[PDB]
Design a protein around this nucleic acid. Structure first.
Lengths: 52, 386, 136
RNA sequence: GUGAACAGCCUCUAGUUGAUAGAAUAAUGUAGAUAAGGGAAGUCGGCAAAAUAGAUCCGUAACUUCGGGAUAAGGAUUGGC
RNA sequence: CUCUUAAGGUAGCCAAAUGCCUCGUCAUCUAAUUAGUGACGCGCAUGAAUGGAUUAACGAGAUUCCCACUGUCCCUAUCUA
RNA sequence: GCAGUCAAGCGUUCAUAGCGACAUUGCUUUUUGAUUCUUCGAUGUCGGCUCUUCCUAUCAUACCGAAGCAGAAUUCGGUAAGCGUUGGAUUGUUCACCCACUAAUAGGGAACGUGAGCUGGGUUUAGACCGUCGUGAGACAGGUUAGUUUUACCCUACUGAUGAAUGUUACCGCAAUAGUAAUUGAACUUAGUACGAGAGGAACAGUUCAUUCGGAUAAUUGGUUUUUGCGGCUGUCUGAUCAGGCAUUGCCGCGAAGCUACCAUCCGCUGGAUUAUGGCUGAACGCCUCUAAGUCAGAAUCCAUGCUAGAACGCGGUGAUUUC
């Protein structure tokens, strides 16, 4: 098991928790949870969001 | 007519009658086949489930693409505080079924169990096992003899056993109780093991062991009066159905001139009792041990207890168990474990699993931190800290 | 799947049934494929065939060159767009439903592929994994 | 008052507060709703529903009784200070 | 050539809301079509104010295909009153 | 429609591997007829949807035999209904055709199952068009178009629930009985082996996965939101602000808990008796023979194990059994 960071939010992602998203530019993103993922689908700014 | 498209039935008929249970607790309709070769030990145990959590390990299945690779799995906790023995009893054969002839009982009994016999305890004299007690206070007289009365007879022996519930978080204040069959040899010895074990506490660590397969026997959840769609997974009917669609249509033909037992119909869904076999153990629980939650590889003083606690259940201060999977029964329910009936090879009942990591994250949310410490380190100080 | 599967497959949430359309990640000359069947599929009353990554199907070309169009041909998924689970525990989903073309036995009739693909179809059908520059 | 507007929504004067009520919250229902991936494969049949929806600006087909088609299509924009 | 007509269906039109045999023959749209469209015509039994051929616009009219849309379906779930 | 018989012939040769003429015996009621017995003081009229059950004359799945069967694949046959038997275009369709997946894509009954269970597409009223016939109202298993689908609260049956009486009451518990369920395929090895001239090309064991079904759970993923929990936006009222009200839950973003999903996860047994069949010994019949006596092994079979209710008139064991 390896521990990661949220491609949106900046959190440790423990195994089989959260999700992953992929993008046809081969790029990978990780999400702890549906919140961050939904912001992502909303194509949002994790630098204007506060709690990141 | 020759039903046009010939498909599966819905349902299992061999779980009927789908009804509520006689009891919340699940009796053991059979026990393992004994060999008169062994030491004495039980064939079962009882415990209170508390929830699930998640487990990380490394697979050794030589041919799986995940061989020697990490995986995750889903397990549950079963609070196994040390069972008590209170009395045994004896059974013997007949032409017409095994049959009891004595129930011997200890001298001193916990108040937390004799409440089982009562329904309005708070206004009683408690007056129980008392004229029996005075059978003791003589050397063994009326008592040992029955044990001998059993040894004379009684192919099959069992043990009346109960819990020190009060340690559990719950406020049931009424222990449960049950039988267990014994599976050493030498019934004359079995009873003697027991006669020693009267009022003597027992822990499962003696009995079960890690990487062992078992069965589980318990009473599934309750949901209640349900419809023919869910209770049986029948179809939902289309949009333009008069008088509801969450139905079954043709419960039967003209002739036969009745309704068959084989038809999806409404009725209770849950509080049944079920038999869940072959769920491996991955770890034993030690109430008198911090780092129950640890592994070889993780190594923090973490227990199994999650941050903010289990849902509806709470702490795991007692001993405990970890078993692979999702077992029948819900939080706070008494669960009758049981050793298997037989010898499963399977190339999976034989794997010495080692644990890598155990998730303690809160389940009252979408948990991040295993722990306040970790949590504190990451976020840092707050307006609460000084 | 079938004749060409370089081994086998741990299940993944089927998310590309019939009537469906999925892009083409190769350079064969088609922009879409029309998923209509699956190999070795289930068999059930008014359930539809479902199809997943690594699976081999039959499809048809709507948009592209006429030598391709208006006929059936085998295809192979490489991207699902539906969140499946890997026994590492994780849930991952591409952003596209994407497949390619082949003969029955696993020869890409094209010459290369774009974008990501999944280790499943990769290790299950080799040639793909050759012409892939990317995998996850 | 918003708004184009006696549209809908809210409010003042004036009038009402009336339809058997209470605790519960299972099925089946009625009426409204929401749903991943897919997208009519259901289907007799896209019935229901969902989407589009205003205003400004641009762009605008074949056919045509040359009057229309035409909100054509199809695209953008819209806040607050 | 010939029988016959009071006259012998002209021009136009179609498997058409009229074409039994008919799921007519060909081509198309489809992966695939008794459908839909186009065309052919010995047309059981088309056809000229019994109105023929066509026709812009209009149509809660019928019929087909495509895009978008969506719990119609896969495949079923949940909440509400 | 289905099955047999005798064997002219075909099959290189060969009647009977597989086939079968000329004739012939029968069977089923799933076609359609035939009859008119019931029902015209009314049994809801085709088809589809859903749901269950049942049969066998078996497509597949098990086990075996036969082959003109080397292997391979195929074919004829046998016990077996246990288990399975699909997605779709067009047609109102039944039926049929086509496509495609398939291990396989078998036939059928149940008041031509099934309308107080749907639908109402066709048929089969009334309106309307056309064509042919008819002087005409009008007709046409000729076409087309639109056209109200009622009632259960009763009895039973099915499901689930409760329940008086057996000295009371409580706890543990046996099991008559009844039901039952798991099924199917692929990949790797074997094995490019066996076999075969070669082309080609296997099998059991064994491992990993999956299909269909079932039963449980809901850690995580996803879904759902009246937690009206949080925050956001409009419109309007509260003098302002603050905090808020209505907007048939105002709308939006999140959204814990709960529920839930092959959209998620886990699990799904081992022994016996046997069929077919092949066999041991061995008679009749001084030989032989799987059989008569006897006997062996052996199937997806049967019964058990196991799993599920617990007989409300089946039961044991056991604790305690009121005083003014």
């Amino acid at each position: 098991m390896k521990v990661e960071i949220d491609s949106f939010s900046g959190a440790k992602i423990y195994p089989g928790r959260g999700t992953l998203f992929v993008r046809g530019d081969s790029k990978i993103f990780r999400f702890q949870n549906s919140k961050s993922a939904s912001l992502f689908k909303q194509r949002k700014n994790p630098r204007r969001i506060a709690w990141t | 007519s020759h039903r046009k498209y010939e498909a599966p039935r819905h349902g299992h008929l061999g779980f009927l009658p789908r009804k509520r249970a006689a009891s919340i607790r699940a009796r053991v309709k059979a026990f393992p086949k004994d060999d008169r070769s062994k030491p004495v030990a039980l064939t079962s145990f009882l415990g209170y489930k508390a929830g699930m959590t998640t487990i990380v390990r490394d697979l050794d299945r030589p041919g799986s693409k995940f061989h020697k690779r990490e995986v995750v799995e889903a397990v549950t906790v079963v609070d196994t505080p040390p069972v008590v023995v209170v009395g045994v009893v004896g059974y013997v054969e007949t032409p017409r079924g095994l049959r009891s002839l004595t129930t011997v009982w200890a001298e001193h009994l916990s108040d937390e169990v004799k409440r089982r016999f009562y329904k309005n305890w708070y206004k009683s004299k408690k007056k129980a096992f008392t004229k029996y007690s005075a059978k003791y206070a003589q050397d063994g007289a009326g008592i040992e003899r029955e044990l001998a009365r059993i040894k004379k007879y009684a192919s099959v022996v069992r043990v009346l056993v109960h819990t020190q519930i009060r340690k559990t978080p719950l406020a049931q204040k009424k222990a449960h109780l049950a039988e267990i069959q014994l599976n050493g040899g030498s019934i004359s010895e079995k009873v003697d093991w027991a006669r020693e074990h009267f009022e003597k506490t027992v822990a499962v660590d003696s009995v079960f062991e890690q990487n062992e397969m078992i069965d589980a026997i318990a009473v599934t959840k309750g949901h209640g009066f349900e419809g023919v769609t869910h209770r049986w997974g029948t179809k939902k009917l289309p949009r333009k159905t008069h008088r509801g669609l969450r139905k079954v249509a043709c419960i039967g033909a003209w002739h036969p001139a009745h309704v068959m037992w084989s038809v999806a119909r409404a009725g209770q869904r849950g509080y049944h009792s079920r038999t869940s076999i072959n769920h491996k153990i991955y770890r034993v629980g030690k109430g008198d041990d911090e780092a129950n939650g640890a592994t070889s590889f993780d190594r923090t003083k973490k227990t199994i207890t999650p941050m903010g606690g289990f849902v509806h259940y709470g702490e795991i201060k007692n001993d405990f168990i970890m078993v692979k999977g999702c077992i029948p029964g819900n939080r706070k329910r008494i669960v009758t474990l049981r050793k298997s009936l037989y010898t499963n090879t399977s190339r999976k009942a034989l794997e010495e699993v080692s644990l890598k990591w155990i998730d303690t994250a809160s389940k009252f949310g979408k948990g991040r931190f295993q722990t306040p410490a970790e949590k504190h380190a990451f976020m840092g100080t707050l307006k609460k800290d000084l | 799947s079938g004749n060409g599967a370089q081994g086998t497959k741990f299940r993944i949430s089927l998310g590309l049934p019939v009537g469906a359309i999925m892009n083409c990640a190769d350079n064969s000359g088609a922009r879409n494929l029309y998923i209509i069947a699956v190999k070795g599929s289930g068999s059930r009353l008014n359930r539809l065939p479902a199809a997943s990554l690594g699976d081999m199907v039959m499809a048809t070309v709507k948009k592209g060159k006429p030598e391709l169009r208006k006929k059936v041909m085998p295809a192979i998924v490489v991207r699902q767009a539906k969140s499946w689970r890997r026994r590492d525990g994780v849930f991952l989903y591409f952003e596209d439903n994407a497949g390619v073309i082949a003969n029955p036995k696993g020869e890409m009739k094209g010459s290369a592929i774009t974008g990501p693909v999944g280790k499943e179809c990769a290790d299950l059908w080799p040639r793909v994994a050759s012409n892939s520059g990317v995998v996850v």
